[PDB]
Each structure stands twice: as C-alpha cells, then as structure tokens.
Design a protein around this ligand. Sequence first.
Ligand SMILES: *[C@@H]1O[C@H](CO)[C@@H](O[C@@H]2O[C@H](CO)[C@@H](O[C@@H]3O[C@H](CO)[C@@H](O)[C@H](O)[C@@H]3O)[C@H](O)[C@H]2NC(C)=O)[C@H](O)[C@H]1NC(C)=O
Ligand SMILES: *[C@@H]1O[C@H](CO)[C@@H](O[C@@H]2O[C@H](CO)[C@@H](O)[C@H](O)[C@H]2NC(C)=O)[C@H](O)[C@H]1NC(C)=O
Ligand SMILES: *[C@@H]1O[C@H](CO)[C@@H](O)[C@H](O)[C@H]1NC(C)=O
Lengths: 285, 48, 283
Amino acid sequence: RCTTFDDVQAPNYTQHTSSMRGVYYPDEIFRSDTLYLTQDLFLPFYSNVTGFHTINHTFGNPVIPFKDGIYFAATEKSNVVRGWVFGSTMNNKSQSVIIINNSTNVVIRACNFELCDNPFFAVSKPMGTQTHTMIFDNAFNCTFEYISDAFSLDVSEKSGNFKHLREFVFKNKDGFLYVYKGYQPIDVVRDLPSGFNTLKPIFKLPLGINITNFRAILTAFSPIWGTSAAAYFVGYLKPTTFMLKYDENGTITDAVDCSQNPLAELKCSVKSFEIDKGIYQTSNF
Amino acid sequence: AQALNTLVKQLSSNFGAISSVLNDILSRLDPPEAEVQIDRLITGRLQS
Amino acid sequence: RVVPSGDVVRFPNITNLCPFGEVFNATKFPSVYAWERKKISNCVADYSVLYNSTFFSTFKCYATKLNDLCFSNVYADSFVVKGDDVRQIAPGQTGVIADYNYKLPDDFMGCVLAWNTRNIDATSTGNYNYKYRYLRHGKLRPFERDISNVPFSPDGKPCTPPALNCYWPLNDYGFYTTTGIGYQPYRVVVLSFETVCGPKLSTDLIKNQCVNFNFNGLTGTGVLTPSSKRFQPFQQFGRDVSDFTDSVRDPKTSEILDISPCAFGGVSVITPGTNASSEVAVL
Ligand SMILES: *[C@@H]1O[C@H](CO)[C@@H](O[C@@H]2O[C@H](CO)[C@@H](O[C@@H]3O[C@H](CO)[C@@H](O)[C@H](O)[C@@H]3O)[C@H](O)[C@H]2NC(C)=O)[C@H](O)[C@H]1NC(C)=O
Ligand SMILES: *[C@@H]1O[C@H](CO)[C@@H](O[C@@H]2O[C@H](CO)[C@@H](O)[C@H](O)[C@H]2NC(C)=O)[C@H](O)[C@H]1NC(C)=O
Ligand SMILES: *[C@@H]1O[C@H](CO)[C@@H](O)[C@H](O)[C@H]1NC(C)=O
C-alpha cells in the first residue's frame, strides 16, 4: 500500500570531498606485479559530493539522474539505504527495476511497477522489521525476477557513530545492470572518512529497462512514517583514465586519476608513481 | 625496452579490421569477411 | 615449430542439445517495442533448429555466427517487423527498430530469423495493429524493452494526447498485402547473444605437453601445468606482463593453470665446408 510520511524534509546537503572512492575491479583478468592504464566509468578523485543527512523527518528520495551510471556510498548506522528504483519516468507508465534488500533476500524485478510517489521500506522502528515493500503494489509486463540467497540484516534505529560503510557502483550496458559492492568497517561522526576502498562485482542483471533516472529507496522508521540517521552520497561515474597499481596477489592497492591536475596527468604519461626531476612532454593542446 | 614494447603494443592495432586478433577474424567471422581483414592486419604488422 | 599433441576441452556440467520451441515453433509474435523475452540457458546449443523449421525463410545470422556460442544466456526474442525495418535489427545501427524498439548487444551476436507472413499477418488496408516506436525522449541501450502504453510528450513538456499538437509514439507499419516486400510483416526470432556453449565437450588435462585447448572463454595452443597464481573469486583468467593470457581457472575443476606457449626457435647449421667434409652439426 502506497502511503506517505507526516513530513518530508530536505537533507543538510553537507559538502564533502570523496578522495579515493569509486575504484573497482572492472574485468575478470588477474594481473600481478604490474601497472595497468585504462578507462571506464569511474568516480573521479576529489569529487565534490553532498551528504544526504536523512534524519527523523528528513527523507531524501526523489528522482535523481543516473544517465550512464552512478556512484553510491553510505556511512550507515540504522541501515537506511538498502534499495534503488531504476527507470525512466518513475510512474506506472514505463518499465522499471526495484532492487530491494528486504532484510532476508535481495529481491529484483523488472516490470511496469505501480510505483508509489514515496519509495520507502515500511519498517517498524523499535525492532527493525519490514511490514511491506511500500514501493510498489503490483506490476505488469515483466522481464525479470530474482531472489538471492537468504541472510539477516538488522535495520533498526541505531545510536552512536556510523559502524558500516558500503560502496556501490551501478551502470547500464547490454541490458546488464552491473552492480558492484565495496565494504569496510568504520567509526564515523560525520559525512564520510577518506581512504582507498575497492569494489568487486556482485550482480549481472539483464533487466532490460531504459535506465535514465534513479530513486534511492530509503528505510522508513516509525512505530505516518518517519526515518532515522544515515548519511549517504550521490556521485557520478565518468569515462576517465585511471592508472591501476597491482600487487603480488592482484589486489588494486592504489590508483591515479589522470585528469585531476597536471601532476597526475604526468604520472599517467610516465606510467609510474615516481617521477624524477625534470620536464616531460605531454599531450598537445 | 621501449623498442620492444613498441613492437609489442602494435600487435593490438586494429589497422582497419574489426579487431586486432587474427584468430577472431579467422574463427568468428565469415570466411569472405575473414580474408579481407587478414589482409589488413598482415600489411599493418609486417610493415610495423 | 613444436607440433602439438593433445586436446584439452574443459567445461562445467554438460547437458544435451535442448529442444528450442522458443526459437522456431512459435505461432504469433507481438510488436517490437514490447518484444516477448524467451531465453535459452544450460544447453549445448548449435541452433540448427533455426534452419530446420517449417515456419521461417531467411536463415541469416549477424552465417557462421550460428556457432558463436560459449557465453551467457541467449534470448530468443519474439516480434513482428516490416520489411523496411528488418534491416534495422542489428547491434547498434539505430534506425527506428534499434533506436527505440529493440537494440542488440555486440559482444557476441546470433541470428535474425524472419518469415514472409504476407498471407497471415497483413491485410489489404495495412495491419496497423502492429506498431513501432519512432519518437521517445531518450534512446534505448542494447537489450531493452519499452512497454509504455502511454501517450507521449514530444519534447518533454506536458503535451500528451488527447491534447492538440501532441504526438503518439507509435507509427503504423503499413502491413499492406497489395504492395511489395518492403511493406510486409516478418515474424522475427532474434537470438540475442548476451549459459550456453556450442563446442562444449569434456576431455582431460593433458598436462606438461604442447596441446590444443578450448576452455570456457579461452582457446589456443600451449603447455598446461598447475599454477600458484592467487585468483580472486571473481576472476576467470590471468594475463602476463604483456597482453597475452597466461593463466586460467579451470571451468570444470577450478584448478589454476599456467599456459606457457609451445616451444620454437631458429636453426643454425655448423659446417667446416664442402672442401673439408660433407657433414654438418645443427643448433
Ligand atoms: C599475498 O597473500 C599472501 C597470502 O598467501 C601473503 O602472504 C602472507 O603474508 C603474511 C604477512 O607478510 C605472512 O605472515 C608472516 O608470518 C611469519 C610467521 O608466522 C611472521 O614471522 C611474519 O611477521 C608475518 O606475519 C604469511 O606467512 C604469508 N603467507 C604466505 C602463504 O605467503 C602476502 O603477503 C600477500 N602479498 C602482499 C604483497 O601482501
Ligand atoms: C562543491 O559544491 C558546493 C556547492 O554545493 C560549493 O559550496 C559553495 O561554493 C561557493 C563557491 O564555490 C561558495 O561561495 C559557498 O560559500 C559554498 N557553500 C558551502 C555551503 O560550502 C563548494 O565550494 C564546492 N567545492 C569546491 C572545492 O569548490
Ligand atoms: C680445397 O682445400 C685444399 C687444401 O688442402 C686446397 O689446396 C684446394 O685448393 C681447395 N680447393 C679449391 C677448389 O680451391
């Protein structure tokens, strides 16, 4: 049942600089003791991002553009952002994809959904359990249906600092929505910590929808729904040139965005992290 | 070391073919489509 | 040259050649914008059933791309085009079929199988019930379906039918029986190519010998031997400091192997001369 909130407020829009985020393993190719220069839809370094503080009435999930691919991050305490609606019009007018983590399974379906104007997880706040997927009610002319393996995730209201950081990377190609996951534990007061954290491929999703927009399904918290504390970002993926440093085990240890500043473009010309003193020729203007 | 790696990386030049792999043009393409693009990658690589 | 001795065909669990009624036996096909998805999985397929059919006429594959098969799911997609829109069914090639109705991936590519249905799927006034998209705010990506039965806004402004100067996204094909081939309806099965494998058998690891090999996603000749390379769980194979593949995780048994190439070299000939003797030694 499509219900609404008692009040929906805009987030704090706290500005943040995502330093080393969005790095992932693009291919299936193991390489070792090497240094590989390539281009894909990456999050650029030092990206100017906004902290969507979702707090207690404040609930930021309208239509946000996707356009090729988005970066997502969320320092989490109450496990609020766990779903994303993908699609074009975000109404019951075109085919859309609702990927949810419903505290038990990852349920993915690609249909003309009876989309609510407020995409949320209808979750009882005092114990963190979901009553209904109040994002859709029914669906028509489907192409895909997926239910992952079972687990359990605690999604109640939590205090203290952020203890969980997940990194997500989405893109549309060949019908395959690619979804990758990064993770680290954290102890975080405000928006995001800096640091290098990679992502690994998790989903290959032949959904078949015109992915032009996205709506992040946040988790609603009320015992008239509300919410509670999480800070999540929206970043954009760009077809930029990265260097990829590979260690003994094929772990991406470090990277250079070639288009930040003339120092880093020089790094990509030399193909090293070490540059000697001098003048080196680079691309014409 | 630069002259070897220049010789290595010009294997991956497509030279106007659908790819730089002679075996993909051999096995995947139709044999009329093959012989034209085998002809392109040799004339590229031999003169490189 | 060292000439190889052995065949190494290593694949996960092998089934038979499946019957594919979705490929050559279906009776009615819909319009292209809302093309019906029918899919193939877990089959050692060759799609000779596209040929051996009483229901089709063209038999063309975008035709040795028939056996272009060691990859993920094949989607035997069902739709009816016009003869002037058969031509726009391709990976890329954004005419009115590929731009707005049905676009194909270009990693591997299968077969566009069509049939002359002038006596069944058309009429003398144009079978206008089949329609196709010619105008939408946004292009399709490859392998997408548009099921929008919605009046359309021609520039993103609130101008939908039934308001004036507000356009429908669908044109009539014009399936006329009184015209030539360019206006005729074709029932089209497209094998959209993006788990099957055509040459999929199972042989044994002929280790430490110059052999032929076919792996899931990998062909060539070389020397096969177990490897110590620390594959991530989401990694299929390895490459060297060049751009040649040197290691692979076994598609059958997950054994990490090395692939060194087969041996070769030049020949010198050592001789003291014909005035001295008539014998040689070779390097
Ligand atoms: C790539 O992964 C391998 C895992 O196979 C890493 O090797 C492991 O590295 C650790 C730390 O260097 C080794 O621990 C050492 O143990 C000895 C004896 O207990 C101790 O005296 C040392 O202080 C150290 O803690 C571990 O033995 C070793 N294991 C193997 C099988 O080699 C390797 O370090 C990774 N590569 C990189 C670049 O980190
Ligand atoms: C990132 O974008 C934000 C806007 O959301 C910038 O914040 C404002 O920037 C202007 C000029 O750059 C200043 O005059 C304002 O005072 C800033 N407002 C706040 C609340 O910070 C921010 O400067 C951008 N980042 C960088 C490095 O320029
Ligand atoms: C062959 O070698 C001998 C050395 O004993 C030399 O005398 C002779 O001239 C050589 N043959 C010719 C055709 O020069």
